[PDB]
Symmetry: C4
Subunit: 206 residues, 4 copies
């Protein structure tokens, strides 16, 4: 079976910790959000969807394949499909974080354009990874597509053709980001959650 058990357990502890941190920020209320971490080139560790991310225990962490399918046999879910999609788009990514903050939810409902943009040299330093011809951090907003494979399709199309790879928003579902490490993903989450705060606060005088 190899040393998967070793890496899996490490990701379990990594995810439980990430969950306590997210919760302390008010970004994963009452079961919303989800967290995943790369176990190996064949398996991913992902938080069970109905569990509160702020009180995880080993039993709440599931092991799936790059097809979003649960190793112990099963059918993929929207969340499981969406994470694997991220892993496939960015081979360097080892962690995916989905938050569901009040600001993200609200922005998902009032933003008329299909993206949120800000331009913050200050915040760019959080994405030393991304090289682009712009200085504006951009966050694409995807529709609440009930058709999962199509939603995935649009996300792939966007990121395959876009220089910016900060994260994305799915209206009525929440924010998604990722990183080469859980630390990098959390940092990205914070950066984006910050933008959502400014974006709205602006639209409280506009």
């Amino acid at each position: 079976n190899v040393e998967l058990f070793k890496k899996f357990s490490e990701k379990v502890e990594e995810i439980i910790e990430a969950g306590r941190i997210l919760h302390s920020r008010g970004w994963v209320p009452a079961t919303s959000g989800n967290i995943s971490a790369k176990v190996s080139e064949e398996y991913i560790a992902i938080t069970a969807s109905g569990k509160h991310k702020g009180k995880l225990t080993p039993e709440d962490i599931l092991l799936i394949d790059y097809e979003g399918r649960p190793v112990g046999g099963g059918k993929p879910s929207a969340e499981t499909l969406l994470h694997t999609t991220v892993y496939k788009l960015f081979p360097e990514v080892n962690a995916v974080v989905h938050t569901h903050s009040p600001n993200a939810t609200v922005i998902s409902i009032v933003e008329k354009k299909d993206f949120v943009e800000l331009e913050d040299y200050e915040l760019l330093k959080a994405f030393p990874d991304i090289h682009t011809h712009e200085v504006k951090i951009k966050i694409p907003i995807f529709p609440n597509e009930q058709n999962i494979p199509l939603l995935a399709k649009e996300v792939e199309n966007y990121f395959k053709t876009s220089e910016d790879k900060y994260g994305f928003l799915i209206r009525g579902h929440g924010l998604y980001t990722w990183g080469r490490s859980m630390e990098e993903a959390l940092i990205h989450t914070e950066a984006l959650e910050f933008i959502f705060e400014c974006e709205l606060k602006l639209l409280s005088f506009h």
Copy 2:
């Protein structure tokens, strides 16, 4: 006397902890709110109304009957009647939480409709209990009925005939939720408090 003393003491510790958690969220300011836990099919443990939920001690926890009456003889109160009402409506419920957050209070005053609604698949996972023909989490708002038995009446009528059983709001009094366990009730409280946040924030641009 049986092992009531055993269960009572466990609920005391459960309630004091729930109170510290609620307070840390700013949901039980200066004595507002109240917490109750099922001791047995004949008794309920409830927080004394004039005590700060964030600094409870065993002496602040009262023992009442399913009639809202204080075991040591006494006359029921509005709060005591309202909780027992919840216990009677839902036999599976073992804990009731009443919060009084700034958002809930405000919503109690500005919402024109008699309910708050949102629709959040994400948040629905917090109510694995409820099965309905809708995807919108709904929260009924009841009037500041001075006539307690009538208020109770309306709450009973609503929930006896409604598929949704998330919680309810009493204008000028606060939010009410419940769960099969204190943990489940707290999680529900968070989910609903989240909706109140988005609801208002929306109405800051509408």
Copy 3:
């Protein structure tokens, strides 16, 4: 010299703790606010005005008389006069807390009427002391009177003739409350700070 030293030291520790609690709430930013505690019928312990209430040490606590004068000889200050005023109005009061929250400051500037009112049975339980013919918690707002003795005069007149004795606001200076114990004062502060939150939030849609 008696056992003043005993009581003084107890109030020192009481005040330092009250200060850490206030600061954690964001109610005493950068030196604003002040805290006082009754040492005896002849002396009061009060926090030095230029010290940050969230990092007090014994050296930051001053001992004054019921005349606001610093025992070691000196001339009274506005703050010292205002607290002694409170102590004189309410003989049962042993602690006075002055906070300076963003909400209080803002309310001090936008409220057109000379008082803030709310009516919250829920919050009334925080003032088991006050008996009145009303159900609305009321907070009088006094002008930024440069003439200290006149400001004091108006405060005395108000409370000598008013049934409500929750606390008061001095525009451009901050909120004031008190209690038979520091715990009671802090609880009152929270109750009033809560009202300031709702009051404004309302005026974000009105």
Copy 4:
């Protein structure tokens, strides 16, 4: 080499702590902001720009000269130039703090005038250092000048000719303050961040 190593290490620990405090306030999200401390009349310790101020370790602290140049040879940066500028303007200053809060960022975008003002006797006590003919705490706003030496020029001109020396804002970059000690700088930061809160909240009803 002298005892620089002694002082440097002390500033390292001072800066890491300041960073944890700033982060807990939500003022240095995802790498934004920066912190510096005077090591000697020839060297300054400054936080690396791309590191998260809330998770600093000795390796993230750089040593530069009063010319903003990195001792180990290198070319100055905007941040490094801006801090040294502050150190040169105020010889008593031993610490510089740059925050990047949601409020500061937002204010940087909506404030039409080139400064923010408030007038708060209460807050003035936080600046026992500054003597002026006014009672209003003033914060000058400088443009997002890509031309660094010119930005520096304007900042110097302002403070060389202004009685107020509370701090300043660079649109799209963040708030800057300083103090004779890190504690004094943090206190100033809080005072200014408070004003930004009130300023906006006002402009939510104006």
